[PDB]
Each structure stands twice: as C-alpha cells, then as structure tokens.
Design a protein around this ligand. Structure first.
Ligand SMILES: CC(C)[C@@H](C)/C=C/[C@@H](C)[C@H]1CC[C@H]2C3=CC=C4C[C@@H](O)CC[C@]4(C)[C@H]3CC[C@]12C
Ligand SMILES: CC(C)[C@@H](C)/C=C/[C@@H](C)[C@H]1CC[C@H]2C3=CC=C4C[C@@H](O)CC[C@]4(C)[C@H]3CC[C@]12C
Lengths: 280, 281
C-alpha cells in the first residue's frame, strides 16, 4: 500500500543513493544497484528498508519527509523481526541486505535521539544477522566476513597488532581458549582496513561471534567484555575518521561515546544489552 | 497505485528508455532523467510512463493487460483535461507524454486492431497541436521540429522535390504565394534529415506542426492539401517498416497502416484523416 512518493523514493535510490554506498568503499555495484532493487519486490521487508534509507538521504535536500523516514523504519523493523521467525533460503540475502541498510540508516538517523530508538533498530538488525550467520557460500553477501597470525613459538597468542595493550592481562591465550576465535577474527579484520567492504566487515562483527564466546559475553564475563571494548575502539575510530566520506556516518561521534561508561542509557553493561539479544 | 506501479517505474528506468534511445533518438538526459523527474510533478505524464513500460513488460511478464489499459485511459483523460489549462511550466510534461502515448499506442495496435489506438493518438496529436510552437527554451524544441533552398534559383518556383516528386507532380510550379509552400518545404527538409538523430520524432510531430492556414484548409477536404498529406503518409509508412525491424514498439504497424488509405478499416481516406486530426476547440 504505497503512494506516489514511494516511486520517487525508489527512483532516488536507484539513481543517487546506492552510488554513495559504493563510494565510501563498498564493492559490487551489481548487488547494490541491481540485486537489491530486484529483491525488494519480493520481500516487503527489504523494500521498507530501502525506502526508509533513501528518504533519510533525501531528507538532506528535500523537506517534509520526516514521517516517511520514521514510518518506514518502523515497518522495516517490524517486518524484519517477524521475518527472522521464519528464515527460508531465498529470503536470506534479502534479510542480510536489509540488515545492513537498517544499520546505515540508523546511524544516519542517530540525531542524538535518546539513543534508545536508533539503538533498538540496530538491535533488530543484529539479531537478524546473527540468526542467518553462517551464510551459505552461495551468498553474494558472503564477503561481509573474512577468512580464518595469532600464537607464536609457544603455541599461545603472545601478541596481537589489533590492540596489544588492550587485552594484555589475557596474554598469553591457549588454543583451547574460548577467546581464541574472536581475537583472531578481530585481529584479522583489523589488518584489513585498506580493502573493499571493510565497513561491512566491521559492521557484521558483533553478529558473527561464535555462540560459545557470545553466550559467555552475555554473562558479563570480563575477558570477553574487554575483548569487545577493543572492537569498539576500532568501530568508533573507523567511523569518526570517515564521517566526511560517508554521508550516513555523520555525527556518529556524538552518539558513540569515547568511554563506554559514559553510555547514556546506563552503563557499559547496559550498552551491550541494548545492542545484543534476539528475542526467544 | 501499488507495488507493480513501483516495479514499473523501475522497469522504465532500467529497460524501457534505453530502447527509446536505441531506435535513433538523442538526449538520454531527457528520457532517463528529465522525464522521470517531471513525472513526479505531473500525474498525466506519470500514467503515460507506467502504461508505456507495462506495455514493454507485457511482452514477457503476463497479466498487465489490465495495467496497460488502465494507465492509458487515465493519461488520456488528465492529458485532455490538461490542454484546457496549458502553462509554460507543464508544457514539456505535455509534449513528453504526447510522444510517450504515441509510442505506447503504436506498440498496442495489433495485426488487425480497431479504433482505440487511433483514439489515443488523436489525443496526443491534438495536445501537440495546441502547444506548438514550443518556446526555443524547451528541451523538446529541436527534438520534434525542422527556407529558400527548396525553390529553383533559376525559375523562382518549386520545380522539383525529392520524396514526393512523382506523387505530387500535378501541384508543380509551387509559387511563394501558395499555402502549400510551408508544408512542402517542411516535408522536403524532413526527408533531407532521415539518418540524423530524432528523425522518428520529427516524423511523428509533423501532423501537429502544420500551419493553421494549411490545416484549416486540409480539414475542408481540399484536394491539394490532401494529396500532400498522402506524401507524408508514404514517408511515415515507409520509415516504420524498416525500423520496425529495429524498434520493438513499431512492430506490426504495417498491419495497421495500409498502403492505400482507401483501405482504412474505419472509412474512406477522408475519415482516416478525421479520426487522427481534430480536437476539442
Ligand atoms: C552500529 C552497528 C555497527 C552495530 C552492529 C554495532 C553497535 C556497537 C556500538 C555495539 C555492538 C556490541 C556492543 C558492545 C558489546 C559488548 C560490550 C561489553 C561491555 O562490557 C561494554 C559495552 C560493550 C563494549 C558494547 C558497546 C556497544 C557495542 C560495541
Ligand atoms: C502515428 C502518429 C505519428 C500520428 C501523428 C500519425 C498518424 C497518421 C497515420 C495520420 C496523420 C494524418 C493522417 C492523414 C491526413 C490527411 C489525409 C488525407 C486524406 O485524403 C487521406 C487520408 C490522410 C492522408 C490521413 C492518413 C492518416 C494520417 C497520415
């Protein structure tokens, strides 16, 4: 059930929006400019994500679209949360796709805005992504990850270039460690900053933690939490440095504090819970 | 409108207008940027465009017969309502849904179609007639239009032409006092531009850009004017069959345009003329 302004919003995407996605350092003009729009006709959930996104961008020059943005994001979150209950295999790329769009769009819509609303939308997208990962290798979206150096001359990580002084206490780490996988993931992603789709790898990281680590993290374990603070230093610094490059990362410095203790919704432990957790 | 309407606007932008350019038309800026943008300001242009692209998608996807017909009449209705209040701001909107509706009508006239495609074309033509002359500032100005060189410089008369020479010998010498001079020069110049870009659109606009003197003269059934239009008809018909092989929406137009106008499925040649020319005042 749509109007004339939706045709325009979709024209605004195929026309102007997705070139800006490519421009910040994403790959595949074919997925973003061809595959997505086609999938959108099949999955209302991705369609509502795409329209909300392009109306957020249009809000930049055309006035009067604040309710489109708001209303479309909501439908997208709703349809997206309902869609996760029944995951098929033909709707998997469409979910991944709308998840990433909802992330870009929520970071763009973080005016300050509590930040509970933007955080809540991102949460949904993290739960959808967590849900569908791992992706078949058949997925055109199976380059939002990385392959997987750590451990040397004693068979236990002794040094990581990713942060080195941020997890020292943990050093050294056994191959048995539950922290191993994440640390390798995180370090390997870090030595990948000068490459295409880095922004999307950085984006997907919280959803691609192994369940062991994650279930461990939600108990508030200190090692894991220290580990994630390293991811956070990477995310925040990568984001605030490219604000001029990406229109939708603008003002992200104002919504992501330096010290997680300064989280506006509570404490660091609260800032983890607002971002992680699906809905069983 | 709904989701199909969106997929359709999307279809236009991805596959319909590149085929318009491909036939021998210039300015991709008008057909893929200017029009879509105007389509948002003017619902009559919008319906024209969704009907066109659904006609083009109809060739493969089935079930849009309803879509094609619904958007085509609605465009006519608003287009026809829109000629009563022309402005300089909606004039290119009007020109462009005229040519769209013209192409969409040629694509929808069948192996043996009736008078519906023609009805629409008549509407397109009468809009066109009402907005011409376009201001030179219009983007469509060079796209749909275009003297002494037709005259023989040693006799002072139109001793001979290309294109219609055998067809209208009886008319010769044509003096500059004649009311057939502007049309004959226009037709000769139209022939003197075939390999050039936008020829199809010049050929298309010709009936709407006759001067009123000639036209009012033609609607009285005057034999001279009329023989002349038969020359335009030989040119329109002759071009469409060769480029029917190179353009999807001119397919089967020979089945609907007879070599003898006397074989008009609706009447005599004077009826074929009346069903294409004429307006609402
Ligand atoms: C914006 C998109 C990319 C989504 C996916 C990322 C959100 C970030 C801000 C979220 C994802 C995981 C969250 C996260 C996980 C774990 C902890 C450990 C805790 O002791 C302090 C908060 C902290 C560190 C939080 C901070 C906020 C994080 C880093
Ligand atoms: C298809 C689009 C391009 C529209 C504009 C053109 C329609 C054509 C087929 C119409 C336009 C003018 C019509 C036309 C005008 C005048 C006469 C004179 C008459 O004694 C015989 C019919 C005849 C020759 C008709 C035949 C059909 C014509 C040539």
């Amino acid at each position: 059930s749509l109007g004339l302004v939706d045709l325009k919003l979709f024209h605004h995407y195929c026309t102007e929006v997705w070139p800006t996605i490519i421009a910040v350092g994403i790959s595949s003009p074919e997925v973003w400019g061809t595959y997505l729009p086609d999938l959108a006709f099949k999955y209302p959930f991705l369609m509502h994500s795409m329209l909300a996104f392009s109306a957020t961008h249009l809000s930049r020059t055309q006035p009067g679209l604040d309710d489109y943005v708001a209303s479309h994001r909501l439908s997208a979150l709703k349809l997206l949360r309902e869609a996760v209950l029944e995951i098929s295999d033909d709707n998997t790329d469409a979910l991944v796709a709308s998840s990433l769009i909802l992330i870009m769009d929520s970071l763009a819509n973080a005016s300050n805005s509590n930040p509970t609303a933007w955080i809540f939308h991102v949460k949904g997208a993290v739960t959808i992504l967590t849900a569908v990962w791992p992706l078949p290798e058949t997925s055109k979206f199976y380059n939002l990850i990385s392959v997987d150096i750590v451990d040397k001359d004693t068979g236990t990580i002794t040094e990581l270039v990713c942060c080195d002084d941020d997890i020292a206490d943990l050093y050294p780490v056994d191959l048995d460690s539950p922290y191993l996988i994440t640390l390798a993931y995180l370090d390997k992603l870090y030595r990948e900053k000068n490459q295409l789709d880095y922004i999307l790898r950085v984006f997907a990281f919280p959803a691609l933690l192994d369940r062991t680590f994650l279930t461990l993290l939600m108990t508030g374990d200190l090692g894991a939490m220290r580990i994630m603070r390293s991811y956070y230093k990477l995310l925040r610094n990568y984001t605030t440095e490219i604000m001029d490059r990406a229109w939708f990362l603008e003002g992200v410095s104002q919504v992501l504090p330096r010290d997680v203790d300064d989280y506006s919704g509570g404490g660091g432990m609260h800032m983890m819970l607002d971002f992680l957790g699906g809905g069983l």
